[PDB]
Amino acid sequence: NALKSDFDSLRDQIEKAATNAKFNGVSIADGSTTKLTFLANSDGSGFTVNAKTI
Amino acid sequence: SLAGIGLTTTSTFTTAAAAKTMIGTIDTALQTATNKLASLGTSSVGLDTHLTFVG
Numbered sequence: 001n002a003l004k005s006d007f008d009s010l011r012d013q014i015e016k017a018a019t020n021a022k023f024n025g026v027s028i029a030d031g032s033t034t035k036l037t038f039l040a041n042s043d044g045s046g047f048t049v050n051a052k053t054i
Numbered sequence: 055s056l057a058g059i060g061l062t063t064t065s066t067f068t069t070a071a072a073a074k075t076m077i078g079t080i081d082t083a084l085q086t087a088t089n090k091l092a093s094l095g096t097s098s099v100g101l102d103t104h105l106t107f108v109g
Contacts, residue, residue, distance in 0.1 A: 043077065043078070043081075044074050044077040044078070
């Protein structure tokens, strides 16, 4: 039972540490979005980076 | 004026894709305005040359 309770606390810590992974209100690792594109040149062509849910 | 460079008094973007189209719109606007200024400068040089010949 003690091992089970510690396992539950550790998975809750995983979920909350993944919840806190935002940079200035935008996150790539918490599943909030499919992908974030970033500027690559002056014409607006992107630099896509797929989101990786954690 | 903005009507003469392909823009509008209320032109704006409300989303990232609207801004992505706005980039090319501003590109074409700056290109045509710069071409117009170059033509005006050529006309000014022509007026100066005619001034010298008239004198």
